[PDB]
Ligand binder design. Structure first.
Ligand SMILES: CCOC(=O)Nc1ccc(NCc2ccc(F)cc2)cc1N
Ligand SMILES: CCOC(=O)Nc1ccc(NCc2ccc(F)cc2)cc1N
Ligand SMILES: CCOC(=O)Nc1ccc(NCc2ccc(F)cc2)cc1N
Ligand SMILES: CCOC(=O)Nc1ccc(NCc2ccc(F)cc2)cc1N
Lengths: 251, 251, 251, 251
């Protein structure tokens, strides 16, 4: 009962901790439970189905509190696999990690809330989602690629920003008298910011052929400068994965 | 009459089966007949031209049933080219393939429908389109490239999802009292989901300068995080074709 | 007066013909005259400024007919530089090229129109724009890159098309009774086609939480599959220019 | 007091001038002061909060004039580090640079305005933003990448422009009689230009099944040709940074 003790310790703190193979199954399904619990929290908002959803939602709240209670327990046990955290002092200190203690705090809030309250449960659910990280890996990856392309990006942010201010001002001048949409500069900026991202709600549009004519030039330019940073970062991620691909195919 | 027998067997089960050269002509034109049959099925919906289209549509239904009846026949014959499926047992078992039997089932439904019915014919037409694959090659290609970029993508899905929930909640707080668009959280989420994809129907827009001010920041961020996965996959497909290009230029 | 004869022949049929250096100046400015002539043709449409624009437009029509008359003359003369088309037979046959004869036909139509008419002049102006090519180089380049990526693209066109038909049908079912936007399938297809491209006019939007819920899933998928082919072709052009870059840096 | 004199000269004309490390902190924070001063200039437009913002804005105007006055002073002093501009003649001529003299002119306008006026201060603030460059580096980078891809781009601009004119004309013909949106060609062009960029305000949309049918084809094409140049330039920037990456990893 030692090699089984020690084996299951290894593979469990493989799955619970940094997971490799089929542990992504478990990490996806725990994501599903926290996620669907957040969704039913949204169904609580509709007063026409508030009572029905609330019925099922306390129940799924039951299961979610039980799931993460046991997950907290099980990880603390299978954390014996750490060669630095072993037996007494390890497992008595491992729950002292930063993420772990905030995690137990979020979990205990989950515990009491079942023992104005819904604000608390919506937020703790969100921290389950953000609890997905435990490392900030996503933030690290995004920061790296944003850093590598700082000159190209800042080129796009500067030139796009200028096109916004310019086009908004011109349209404001041409359509300040004959239109009620463009009453003050702040309205012309809302209009510029909402066309250049190609959202185009339709609540403010120019209606004199001068406004149409000036928007039509800075539009053709600006809408393509607001769409660069998505294009630049998209290519950056793909290129970076190709390089990590080959580098890893060797080492 | 053997070498002609055997020649036309080869080139026909080249064209009907895995096609190389001018067989893409035939596969495109059969796609046209199934496609245009689906379109006339849509024209059936307009009651102002329902009768005219329905007139022509039973006729093109005639041709389509005849075409695929003969295609079923001709492929079963020219399937003698299979070195594993030869004469009796092959051609008597080749129609036992999974895709082939579902194909004959869809075809026989086509046969009876010309012998509440229009629901059946719209669906069988759809299965002609999905019958285009016979291999799931498109699904394989998409799955490969989605798999290769799982870390970059999940970075985008996580950070975009957070920006959605955050911006929707802030705008909901700033514009819950002075506006009828944002009545419940579920409305604020519909608004967030429809601006961040830059659809912008225009049915819900913020109208207090607090809502405009908070949307204008998470908008500039979010609309570019919802547009990544198209950008990442787009670069992924192009890069992958370049690598298959060179690799094949050798081997 | 021979070396000057022959020199200016060379550099002129350099500029007029396949241009290298500062001949792009001339080709841009001739593009400006044809272009601005088309624009004033559009100003003719507004009856409030029809007369003013029409005033200036016959005048710029004067200059444009004179410009291209002389260009036709000058190119036919400087075409002596062709080692195959020399003196009598060359310059007497060079105007027999396909593009040249259609060009003289368009020019002569320009001549007579100044000697229901505006339909003719709008069209001939368009053929000046399309006359920019003379080779179909742009069509060749686009066809090459579309050809190279046929498998990735057709993956996107197939999967996007399916998502359209599917989402439109589901939304049609959920919102056929409680809404006047979605009356027939053809309306649901117009709605699907206009959200998935993220145009979003706002004339048709779902208004029952079932329609919002089903659109919100196929939206998140579809809007990113309709945006691939721009992303794929965009990366394709950039990659191809890098390869032609290095290849030419050698040879 | 010489080595301290000379040391701080070096590191200061490192930070103020071409900055390397933590000088980006200072250059970001000076960007914040000019930027937030522009924003409060916009809050001046809303007459409901005009007085409150104007209150705080003269104050932040105080700090901004003092900041750039001292920056002008301090840079002129620490400009002794220039091996060509040293002591008397250098520091007496260094303020004779083009950017420096326009900068002092903008600064002195800032000085007098605190000693119809708001038009002047909004513009000078803008020139602080454009003063960020001092070199046109962003313009240089954009021009380089636009130049490198001139053939692919002009392919996109030509083919997209044709699709615009074509689709707008067809829709104009099909929906000129039965609709008030499309009254003249100029309206059909506004509609075409605003759908093809996927803005889609919603003020003009086709409403006869002929207009819907013709828009639906040139839409599927055009909206993807208007989105190329963002895609091409996006890939161009990313590719170019990868090449500068490796080249610099060597030299
Ligand atoms: C992808 C990460 O987030 C983005 O890079 N997005 C983004 C950021 C800025 C801009 N434009 C410049 C601008 C700056 C300030 C302003 F107040 C207004 C406009 C465009 C985009 N797409
Ligand atoms: C291309 C294949 O499909 C996509 O990757 N598309 C996509 C998927 C998700 C997101 N955002 C995150 C999100 C997640 C859940 C939610 F309920 C709401 C938002 C954005 C896009 N474009
Ligand atoms: C860039 C050159 O043109 C494009 O490749 N564009 C494009 C073509 C098709 C699709 N979707 C599939 C579809 C097919 C048929 C239909 F009737 C409806 C939808 C999307 C885009 N963007
Ligand atoms: C990124 C830098 O700016 C752009 O390249 N943008 C852009 C420029 C033109 C076009 N279309 C062609 C056209 C030309 C003239 C016209 F009067 C109307 C249409 C599309 C885009 N996106």
């Amino acid at each position: 009962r030692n090699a089984f003790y020690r084996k299951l310790q290894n593979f469990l703190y493989n799955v619970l901790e940094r997971p490799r193979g089929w542990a992504f199954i478990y990490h996806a399904y725990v994501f599903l439970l926290v996620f669907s619990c957040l969704v039913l929290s949204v169904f609580s908002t509709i007063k026409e189905y508030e009572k029905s959803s609330e019925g099922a939602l306390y129940i799924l709240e039951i299961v979610t509190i039980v799931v993460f209670g046991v997950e907290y327990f099980v990880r603390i046990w299978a954390a014996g696999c750490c060669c630095r955290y072993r037996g007494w002092r390890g497992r008595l200190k491992f729950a002292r990690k930063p993420f772990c203690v905030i995690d137990i705090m979020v979990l205990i809030a989950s515990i009491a809330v079942l023992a104005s309250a819904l604000r608390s449960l919506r937020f703790l659910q969100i921290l389950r989602m953000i609890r997905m990280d435990r490392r900030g890996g996503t933030w690290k990856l995004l920061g790296s690629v944003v850093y590598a392309h700082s000159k190209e990006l800042v080129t796009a942010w500067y030139i796009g920003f200028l096109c916004l201010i310019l086009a908004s001002f011109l349209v404001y001048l041409a359509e300040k008298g004959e239109n009620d949409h463009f009453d003050t500069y702040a309205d012309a900026l809302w209009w510029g910011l909402i066309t250049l991202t190609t959202i185009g709600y339709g609540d403010k549009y120019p209606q004199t052929w001068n406004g149409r004519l000036l928007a039509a030039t800075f539009t053709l330019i600006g809408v393509s400068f607001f769409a660069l940073p998505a294009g630049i970062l998209g290519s950056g991620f793909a290129l970076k994965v190709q390089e990590q691909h080959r580098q890893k195919h060797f080492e």
